[PDB]
Design a binder for these strands. Structure first.
Ligand SMILES: Nc1nc2c(ncn2[C@@H]2O[C@H](COP(=O)(O)OP(=O)(O)NP(=O)(O)O)[C@@H](O)[C@H]2O)c(=O)[nH]1
Ligand SMILES: Nc1nc2c(ncn2[C@@H]2O[C@H](COP(=O)(O)OP(=O)(O)NP(=O)(O)O)[C@@H](O)[C@H]2O)c(=O)[nH]1
Ligand code: SF4
Ligand code: SF4
Ligand SMILES: [Mg+2]
Lengths: 595, 182, 61, 70, 118, 263
RNA sequence: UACCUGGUUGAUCCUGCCAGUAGCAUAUGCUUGUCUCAAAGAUUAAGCCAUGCAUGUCUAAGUACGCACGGCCGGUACAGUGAAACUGCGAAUGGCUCAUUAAAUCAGUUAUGGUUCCUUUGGUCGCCUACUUGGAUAACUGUGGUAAUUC
RNA sequence: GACGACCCAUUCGAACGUCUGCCCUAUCAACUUUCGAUGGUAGUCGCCGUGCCUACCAUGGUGACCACGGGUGACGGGGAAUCAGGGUUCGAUUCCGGAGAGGGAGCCUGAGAAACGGCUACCACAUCCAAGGAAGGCAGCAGGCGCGCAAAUUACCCACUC
RNA sequence: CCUUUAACGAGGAUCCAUUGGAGGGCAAGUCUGGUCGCAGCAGCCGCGGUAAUUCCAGCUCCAAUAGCGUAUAUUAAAGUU
């Protein structure tokens, strides 16, 4: 049914004035195995996790109310809204789609969030244990009788609530559908709202341009636009804020916020920093084990829910384990040996062009055994430049050829290699620096073994991103080209993986061109920063490379947007466009505090 | 709301003498359980208690007159007592078996059309009888005296006028799809 | 046997005035809307938290 | 040992081979013998017996219409 | 935190407030809350101030005093019309009301008037 | 619960002479304040759907009373509940019907239809005499009318005929032995008989013997007696039953004699 | 139905308790076709609580210059329909719990000639302004502050 | 016709006061008093009567007919289970009366409240925050955690009854 | 839902009645196999030490029956308050 365990530290939990009744009257510490370990001492009482059967006897006759009782998460065939079959993922609860507010849905990766949306949409209908010899619009309505979802599902039947979703992935599509320029979006539908959507989407650029010439930005934009302009009753946004600019993301959240108020239901996902404050008004957290079981907790207020999700484990109200610092790198460390020797290369100030783009580079120092960070706004000319330097098109005048072999990290990842991932891992090698490495990205807590086997076709975003992360330190090459690793990863998985990537390429002597849109992702991974400046579909200047601080200040001076440090935990928190203090930071120009 | 029991259990759990009487009584009338017996004996012992009061009350007390007069009418109206008696002393001469004569299944068998008593209970339940104009399904009708000359079969049944059953009309369709087209 | 209860009005308008609504709509000439239940209360509490202008919430959510 | 007092009680186990269906350091449910204070039969010092191991009866474990849930 | 009168030195003080005082809205009759407010005496700790023009100077500031907006409404009461247009007691007011134009409605323009009282 | 006055009365708390059931819901009507007391009232709506059965639901009575077909004491009332009690006249002028509220020998408010000529007045007991300002007297009655300048020999426990049209009583009865009386409360209720004797105690709770024309003597408190007219000669119309107060045995005999439950 | 039976001894008669027996109400095991009625987080923690909802209210008849709808043209109490806002009234009723509480609570009986009472019902209604007096607030219009509030 | 207002009566009550009625315990037998205990006189206060309170004065009041003290898994009653007669045991719980809304105290409004779906403060908790501040009380219906041997749907609806 | 009514709907193998007990108290086996003071049963009295009417099983039988068993509070039995 569930799990139970004891917890011990408290304000004057005093093992030096209680005689220690917890050790004296615990059944486990009597049959031989020391569950509770304590003495008359200066520290705290120690209590194990694994050996505690549950009971609560120690709690009822500890002389100080220091020891409380937690209950750890476990499956016990309870609710069970659906399963695929056996030895496979299952979900228990899909809960209230409260109207007039937007419902924010916030859990680790591979937990069933997307699956809950599929069920809510009426498309993949729920199976509820079994196997699923009951459907049909009767038995499930009888099962969730006495509640609410009877009224919801009967209104769906009858298609009184019309379904729309923004899909999780880009790739299969710009591949599965096709799009007539202008005409397409045009004979989409209808008026004033599309003009509001495309204009408040802050694009003004792709009105006269074919889809195939566009990138992430354009794609997402058009997508959201059409989705909204789509005359319907319900509305779902899965993952709407991936691989988009920081300024542009805020103006996406408020265009979503337009649809909410007058008896309409709305479900959003997301893996946020502190922008979820403007996305949603109810936050609903999901827990469990990645790719095994997922449980949805009942919804909370956004402020209250946010911290309790990143706090490290908030229950009351249940309970769990893990969860804590991750909104950064707090990986206090630095320094090396003597670094000898090195070089000074240097790449020249090339001028590049395509058709509707004037793209310019400035000369800079690309140091041996050292990171380089690219940004800067969407459309600011970063990716196609790197391909043009390596070999694809260019140059008209001059260039520098790579001294070292080359590792290509791609951003447009939707690969097609039929058979298995294990077959593709043989085009790399699993003997080299054989001591952990892929195993040091992930193995013990989230599992890999988890990265082999299975098909790449059915693999989810962050795991698919990890396939690409492996494909880079896996052919023999030492100069690394990486665009957007923060794509489809959260905070828990991204920050540790990013620190591991930096440790590899710095320690055995390499250089990597990282193209992050993540404060935590960009910062802890930065040095030079190089800054890209200029307006989309016009002009791109890579600013002559300067200081992490000075380059980040150039990016945020033009945009007009800033961050605050969470003072207890060292965590970033975005500002609300225009505030009070949002004026001291603008003047002090300082957008980072506490180096 | 308001509920109460209609029977009581015996004080002794077992007693060779008692069990034979309860068994052989159930055999005669086709009763399902002892709960159908003790039910009768609760009502009777209740009536035997009320009577036992009024005999000790003063003769020509107004309470004693009005109760007895309207009581004995009810005992005569169901026909467990005669009006050639008509006094309270004969209440105590009343006993268990006289009631059971006025049960529906007993009156079907005794004064109507049945085989053995075990048959007659089935006819009551399978809706082949009526009481004056009204179908019944309860063999515990206990039947008022006036209504004994209106016990008849039902007016929609294969017993008397009305549509046949599904054993006959089945076999009729065996002449048309069992040997007429099959 | 079956037993019911019947009215007979002298004119239409005497029925149409007096008559509980569902009995008139029983053989149609009236309906209901209105619209289910709930959408009323959640709007009411939102209207409560504005002053002067509540025309957004009445149409607008 | 009990949940809500932490004090100790010595409890009989019924029919043959039902001892095996009780495993150490699990929960159980106890109950008096049916004499309401006094030790019953030829066994001294025991005033309690055992009925359910873990939401499952000693009967169904013994008879074989249920199995251990672990 | 708002500024009210009669709240000498400029600290932030929590006063009892009720109906008929600055910076209070009752949500129930007889209700009394204890909100914080801030003093009269001006410092540079303030976000914004409201200055009312009292005396008009020689010059005309371009964005305000050059702009001219007429006041909207005439009186609704009887005796204010009498005082305004300086009528006698006997003249029988019935045509001395302001007529307020409805500019458009896609039909025709109306001229509205209020309803006299007393 | 209480901190101020209550506004509900349930089914089972309510009196038994309104003859309420128990399979309609928890609440009962509760009469609103007026001249009569709630253990002596017949609320209006209980007359219209638990007696006469014109109405069937409380919402129907709300649609009826608004039309102003109802009167009570010659004036017009227009609410679901009004606390009419003993000796008042209801008047529906559309049907041409007039009722009177009076007691059965059972002790409950019956239907006592009457001529419209009879329904132009009612009989009212005097309860208190009170000298007002500047040498003016007053009366006080159980229907709570204050009638100024009465005749100066009328005293409490007398009864007076009031003309509903103009007030200002025309005539009266004087409380005397051998006059005919009706009971209005207590264990004896609805019995009619002459006074016969009085009994006085200095203090309170004086009693009043009564005897009827069936040769039975009984007594009741003073303050439950109401005068109806001089000896064996009511100045009102009387219902069937007529205060005989039959035993239960004799009532059985009547029913099986006429054999009356069908027409 | 005002009822007893087994157990101290080699055997008998007592004293006496234990056990057997029937009802009732809580928990629990095993089993379960059809029909009606329906009790249900009191026992222990009057422990702690996410979210949603549970108290509002306009007639012919207090106040309509919403740039609202409408008009058949208006305003000369002046429309018909009318959001908002001031005003009147209710929110002290109900629902829930059993912690406190041993002449206290409470029940029967009595007392206001020791007092208060919204409301209803009935009475009470003449020792350069009166052809109608005085001056401000909301909605509304427009400009704002705060990370945030029915500010 | 509608509304409002002064007084009297009426209705719905409210508040004090009379007489009688109570479970276990003496390993609880003397208790109460200028920190008013009982009474007298005058005054204050209060809707009114009154040691309710204050000044002055007296020395009383209560108890083996069980006071005083302690205990109660004690809210009271209408009732319920068992029962030949007499009894015994139970009564949180649908009607009536009472008390209380996390623990204490104070107070506004009103005819009516020492109100908690009103307010202010302290104490115990717990929430948000840009750390400047702000907001809260499910023993209401559902629902969750905890506690235990032990107890239901975050359903539908003002048609009935009010 | 109930009542009312089309059309399908019973050959006993399934359109399947269980819960306890059979030495005495107390209604029903000095039947068959296994165990041998072991394992267990037993409110109580007592059963098991190789011929067990009481244990573990089979067959048969008995009681109540859509109910029956078990634990605990409490009344009757108790003229053992
Ligand atoms: N075998 C199998 N597994 C599937 C299928 N669809 C989803 N899964 C698995 O179900 C788990 C969760 O899927 P999903 O809901 O997409 O996860 P997520 O929480 O959305 N992942 P992320 O946080 O990275 O965005 C994963 O382990 C995934 O592999 C399928 O068709 N077959
Ligand atoms: N006019 C035009 N634009 C093109 C063509 N090919 C690509 N682009 C667009 O030109 C821009 C170049 O910047 P790019 O390096 O793609 O930006 P990014 O690194 O993808 N930035 P972001 O991820 O924030 O969206 C992109 O928006 C891309 O879609 C082309 O042939 N013509
Ligand atoms: S926990 Fe309670 S018991 Fe264990 S040590 Fe701290 S105080 Fe002493
Ligand atoms: S909880 Fe149960 S197990 Fe863990 S310590 Fe307290 S008692 Fe020992
Ligand atoms: Mg996903």
């Amino acid at each position: 049914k569930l799990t139970r365990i004891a917890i011990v530290n408290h304000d004057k939990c005093k093992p030096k004035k209680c005689r220690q009744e917890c050790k004296k009257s615990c059944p486990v510490v009597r049959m031989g195995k020391l569950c509770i370990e304590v003495t008359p001492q200066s520290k705290i009482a120690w209590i194990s996790e694994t050996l505690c059967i549950g009971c609560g006897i120690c709690i009822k006759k500890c002389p100080f109310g220091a020891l409380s009782i937690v209950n750890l998460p476990s499956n016990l065939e309870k609710e069970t809204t659906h399963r695929y079959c056996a030895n496979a993922f299952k979900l228990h609860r899909l809960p209230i789609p409260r109207p007039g507010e937007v419902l924010g849905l916030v859990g680790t990766n591979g937990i069933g969030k997307s699956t809950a949306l599929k069920i809510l949409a009426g498309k993949q209908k729920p199976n509820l244990g079994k196997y699923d010899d009951p459907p049909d619009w009767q038995e499930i309505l009888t099962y969730f009788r006495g509640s609410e979802l009877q009224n919801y599902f009967t209104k769906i039947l009858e298609d009184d609530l019309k379904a729309i979703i923004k899909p999780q992935y880009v790739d299969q599509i710009p591949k599965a559908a096709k799009g007539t320029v202008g005409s397409i979006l045009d004979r989409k539908d209808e008026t004033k709202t599309q003009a509001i959507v495309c204009q408040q989407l802050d694009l003004t650029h792709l009105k006269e341009r074919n889809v195939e010439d566009l990138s992430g930005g354009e794609l997402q934009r058009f997508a959201c636009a059409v989705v909204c302009i789509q005359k319907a009753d319900i509305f779902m946004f899965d993952e709407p804020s991936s691989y988009l600019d920081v300024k542009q993301r805020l103006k996406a959240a408020i265009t979503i916020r337009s649809l909410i108020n007058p008896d309409r239901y709305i479900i959003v996902v997301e893996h946020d920093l502190s922008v979820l404050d403007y996305l949603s008004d109810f936050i609903c957290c999901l827990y469990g084990v990645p790719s095994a079981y997922g449980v949805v907790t009942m919804p909370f207020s956004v402020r209250e829910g946010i911290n309790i999700f990143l706090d490290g484990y908030v229950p009351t109200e249940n309970l769990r384990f893990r969860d804590a610092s991750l909104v950064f790198k707090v990986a206090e460390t630095a320094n090396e040996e003597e670094v000898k020797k090195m070089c000074m290369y240097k790449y020249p100030g090339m001028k590049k062009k395509m058709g509707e783009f004037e793209l310019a580079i400035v000369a800079g120092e690309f140091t041996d055994s050292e990171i380089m960070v690219m940004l800067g706004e969407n459309g600011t000319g970063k990716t196609t430049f790197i391909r043009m330097l390596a070999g694809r098109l260019k140059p008209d005048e001059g260039g520098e050829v790579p001294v070292l072999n080359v590792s290509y990290k791609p951003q447009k990842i939707s690969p097609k290699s039929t058979g298995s991932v294990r077959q593709l891992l043989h085009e790399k090698i699993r003997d080299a620096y054989t001591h952990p490495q892929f195993v040091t990205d992930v193995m013990k807590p989230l599992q890999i073994e988890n990265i082999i086997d299975q098909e790449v076709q059915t693999l989810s975003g962050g795991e698919l991103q990890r396939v690409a992360l492996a494909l880079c330190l896996g052919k023999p090459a030492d100069v690394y080209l990486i665009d957007e690793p923060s794509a489809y990863l959260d905070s828990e998985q991204r920050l540790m993986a990013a620190r591991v990537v930096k440790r590899f390429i710095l320690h055995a002597k390499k250089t990597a061109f990282v193209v992050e849109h993540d404060f935590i992702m960009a910062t802890y991974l930065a040095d030079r920063v190089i800054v890209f400046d200029g307006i989309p579909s016009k002009n791109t200047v890579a600013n002559s490379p300067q200081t992490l601080l000075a380059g980040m200040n150039k990016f945020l001076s033009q945009l007009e947007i800033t961050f605050r440090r969470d003072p207890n935990n060292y965590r970033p928190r975005i500002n609300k466009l225009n505030s009070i203090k949002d004026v001291e930071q603008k003047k002090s120009g300082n957008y980072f505090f506490l180096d | 709301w308001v509920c109460r029991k209609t029977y009581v259990t015996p004080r002794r759990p077992f007693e060779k003498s008692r069990l034979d009487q309860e068994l052989k009584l159930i055999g005669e009338y086709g009763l399902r359980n002892k709960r159908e017996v003790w039910r009768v004996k609760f009502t009777l012992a209740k009536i035997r208690k009320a009577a036992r009061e009024l005999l000790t009350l003063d003769e020509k007390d107004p309470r004693r007159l009005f109760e007895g007069n309207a009581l004995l009418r009810r005992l005569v109206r169901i026909g467990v007592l005669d009006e050639g008696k008509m006094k309270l002393d004969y209440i105590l001469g009343l006993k268990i078996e006289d009631f059971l004569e006025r049960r529906l299944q007993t009156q079907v068998f005794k004064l109507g059309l049945a085989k053995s008593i075990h048959h007659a209970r089935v006819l009551i339940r399978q809706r082949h009888i009526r009481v004056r104009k009204q179908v019944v399904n309860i063999p515990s009708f206990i039947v008022r005296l006036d209504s004994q000359k209106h016990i008849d079969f039902s007016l929609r049944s294969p017993y008397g006028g009305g549509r046949p059953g599904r054993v006959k009309r089945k076999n009729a369709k065996k002449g048309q799809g069992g040997a007429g087209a099959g | 046997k079956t037993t019911g209860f019947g009215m007979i009005y002298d004119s239409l308008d005497y029925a149409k005035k007096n008559e509980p609504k569902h009995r008139l709509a029983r053989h149609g000439l009236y309906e209901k809307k209105k619209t289910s239940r709930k959408q009323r209360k959640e709007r009411k509490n939102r209207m409560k938290k504005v002053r002067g202008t509540a025309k957004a919430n009445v149409g607008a959510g | 040992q009990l949940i809500k007092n932490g004090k100790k009680i010595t409890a009989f186990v019924p029919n043959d081979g039902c001892l095996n269906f009780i495993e150490e350091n699990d929960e159980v449910l106890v109950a008096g013998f049916g004499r309401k204070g006094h030790a019953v039969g030829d066994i001294p010092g025991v005033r309690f017996k055992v009925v359910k191991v873990a939401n499952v009866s000693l009967l169904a474990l013994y008879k074989g219409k249920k199995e251990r849930p672990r | 935190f708002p500024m009210k009168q009669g709240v000498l030195t400029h600290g932030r003080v929590r006063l009892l407030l009720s109906k008929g005082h600055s910076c209070y809205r009752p949500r129930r009759t007889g209700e009394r809350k204890r909100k914080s407010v801030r003093g009269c005496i001006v410092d540079a700790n303030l976000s914004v101030l409201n200055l009312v023009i009292v005396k008009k100077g020689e010059k005309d500031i371009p964005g305000l005093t050059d702009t001219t907006v007429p006041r909207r409404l005439g009186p609704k009461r009887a005796s204010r019309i009498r005082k305004l247009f300086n009528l006698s007691k006997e003249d029988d007011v019935r045509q001395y009301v302001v007529r307020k134009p409805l500019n458009k409605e896609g039909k025709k323009p109306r001229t509205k008037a209020p309803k006299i009282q007393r | 619960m209480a901190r101020g006055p209550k506004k509900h009365l349930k089914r089972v708390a309510a009196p038994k002479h309104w003859m309420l059931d128990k399979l309609t819901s928890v609440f009962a009507p509760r009469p609103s304040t007026g001249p009569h007391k709630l253990r002596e009232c017949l609320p209006l709506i209980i007359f219209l759907r638990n007696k006469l059965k014109y109405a069937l639901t409380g919402d129907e009575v709300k649609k009826i009373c608004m039309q102003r077909f109802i009167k009570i004491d010659g004036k017009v009332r227009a609410d679901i509940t009004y606390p009419a009690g003993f000796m008042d006249v209801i008047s529906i002028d559309k049907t041409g019907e007039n009722f009177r509220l009076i007691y059965d020998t059972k002790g409950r408010f019956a239907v006592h239809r009457i001529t419209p000529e009879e329904a132009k007045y009612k009989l009212c007991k005097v309860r208190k005499i009170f000298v007002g300002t500047k040498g003016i007297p007053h009366l006080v009655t159980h229907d709570a009318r204050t009638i100024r300048y009465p005749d100066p020999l009328i005293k409490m426990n007398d009864t007076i005929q009031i003309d509903l049209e103009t007030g200002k009583i025309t005539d009266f009865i004087k409380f005397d032995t051998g006059n005919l009386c009706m009971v209005t409360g207590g264990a004896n209720l609805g019995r009619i008989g002459v006074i016969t004797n009085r009994e006085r105690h200095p203090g309170s709770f004086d009693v009043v013997h009564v005897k009827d024309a069936n040769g039975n003597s009984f007594a009741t408190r003073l303050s439950n007696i109401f005068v109806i007219g001089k000896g064996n000669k009511p100045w009102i119309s009387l219902p069937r039953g007529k205060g005989i107060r039959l035993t239960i045995a004799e009532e059985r005999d009547k029913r099986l004699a006429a054999k009356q439950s069908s027409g």
